Copies of this chain bind each other. A is one copy, B any other.
Amino acid sequence: QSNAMELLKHLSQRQYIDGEWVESANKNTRDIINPYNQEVIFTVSEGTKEDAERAILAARRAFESGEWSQETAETRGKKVRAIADKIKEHREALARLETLDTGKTLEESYADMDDIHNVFMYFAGLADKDGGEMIDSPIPDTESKIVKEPVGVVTQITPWNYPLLQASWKIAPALATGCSLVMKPSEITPLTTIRVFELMEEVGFPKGTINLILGAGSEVGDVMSGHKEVDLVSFTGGIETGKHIMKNAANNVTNIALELGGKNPNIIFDDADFELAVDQALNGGYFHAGQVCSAGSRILVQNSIKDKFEQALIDRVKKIKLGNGFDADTEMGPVISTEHRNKIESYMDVAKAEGATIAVGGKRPDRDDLKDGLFFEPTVITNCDTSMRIVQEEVFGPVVTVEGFETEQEAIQLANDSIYGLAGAVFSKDIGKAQRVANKLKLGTVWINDFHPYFAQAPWGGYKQSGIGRELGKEGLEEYLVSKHILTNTNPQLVNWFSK
């Protein structure tokens, strides 16, 4: 862990606007915390509205200059590839900074860095593969083509749980398509985003193509979502903030891409491989202490094996090892902040009040090495039903609910009974049945006999309140493009509708 602290000795503490590392316009700063020990680890600039607007205007100026937007797609791909290579080269430092900033295990952080390399690499390869189309015009003597152009100036806002990963999903396609961008990471987790800006700067982009704003969402966020020079706002986070952003984006009829979490079902039939299902239910509920957009917080298990499954899950939950993300034996780290731990704690009272049982966990751990950190015990909530708040709302902590179902129709009905629609799983050795269910779930991603996979090759996003648009895949790239129909009349003749 002190080796990670050493990394901070060379890390920038500033915003990056129009090709320069700059302080806040009023010199304000913010102290960054390590959730493992609640110690202040770094101090960064806290930007102003003026800074955010300046970055947006620099992005517009750069976009209009054409240096990046009119560069060949092949060359843009090379630059995006160079970024992927930097990430891999600095994987260790990046993974350690991510663990320090966010608390999750170092092995999870390394996995994030592998994913990030692959995201940049995927978009590097896609950059030059589709420039638009030739249309067969229904009008004689005309030519019709659709040209795909970069959407323009894009603002990008990320959350605190997977900072660099979420940033990469936005940055890679933006750069690949020729856009100029302004990014703002979560004010409590800026370290790896600062670092990636330092790396991108070495790759070499024209002034203003990339810009980094650091600051509170209530201060600079509205500028980023409501400015008339922005062509697209892309946000990953919670529903309350996402709705706010969308309403603000409306003022200029600005494109929005949103991913807003979920209430992700994990559907376990009685003909599932039982021990696989237990394993994956643990993984679904407790990776990163449940702070994952796709966390499997809502377990739905067939009635015939429900009690056995609950007991098996509880027995394993008792063995989950909490601690420092830098310690190799740690299986689950702390939650992100005092506010977030307070949210999770409040839900325990809620669950009990509405009739559910806390079968295991449901409080902070007592153990000595955990008392100064933001820890919360992995928790199983039983005797639940779909009417309850603890089932319907995104807790975003190390908490899972267990509900029973009798039939395949009942599972589908329950799984779809939420305001969300991000991801979910179906476990059954009967692949035919699993497919039937998968076809009926209103979710952007359905895993059959798995839990958690996402990758650059495939689009990710939500039905219903889980979002608008997609990230990753060809659809992810398309968020950063705009279509133009250029129609040429090759034998123009007067219409003579109006009197001569």
Interface of chain A residues 237 through 291 with chain B (CB within 8 A): 239, 242-243, 246-247, 249-255, 258, 260, 273, 275-276, 279-280, 282-283, 286-287
Give the interface segment out of A185-193, A346-354, A386-394, A466-474.
A466-474
Among A74, A124, A490, find the residue whose CB has the most chain B CB atoms closer than 10 A: A74
Contact A498 B138, beta carbon cutoff 8 Å:
no
The contact sample of 25 A-B pairs, CB cut-off 8 A, is: A124-B125, A125-B125, A126-B129, A130-B133, A132-B134, A138-B456, A138-B457, A152-B463, A231-B464, A243-B251, A246-B247, A253-B465, A282-B498, A283-B497, A321-B499, A331-B499, A432-B490, A434-B488, A436-B490, A438-B486, A444-B483, A445-B486, A446-B484, A448-B487, A461-B483
**Nearest B residue (CB) for A108:** B497
Interface of chain A residues 432 through 467 with chain B (CB within 8 A): 432, 434-436, 438-439, 442-450, 453, 455-467
Quick one: copies of this chain in the complex? Answer: 4
Residues of B within 8 A of A147 (CB): 134, 439
A465 to B453 Cα, complex, angstroms: 37
**Nearest B residue (CB) for A332:** B498
Contact A457 B144, beta carbon cutoff 8 Å:
yes
Q: Is A40 an interface residue (CB 8 A)?
A: no
Contact A448 B489, beta carbon cutoff 8 Å:
yes
- Chain A: interface size category: 35 or more
Residues of B within 8 A of A146 (CB): 134, 458-459, 473
Residues of B within 8 A of A125 (CB): 77, 124-129
Contact A445 B494, beta carbon cutoff 8 Å:
no
Q: Is A339 an interface residue (CB 8 A)?
A: no
Q: Is A118 an interface residue (CB 8 A)?
A: yes
- A112: min CB distance to chain B, Å: 15
Ranked 7 nearest A-B pairs via Cβ = A125-B125, A132-B134, A73-B136, A131-B136, A450-B489, A246-B250, A319-B499
**Contact string against B for A residues 404-444, beta-carbon threshold 8 Å, 1 for contact and 0 otherwise:** 00000000000000010000000001111011101100111
- Whether A287 contacts B144 in the complex (CB less than 8 A), given A447-B487, A485-B446, comes out as no
Q: Is A383 an interface residue (CB 8 A)?
A: no
A443 to B126 Cα, complex, angstroms: 25
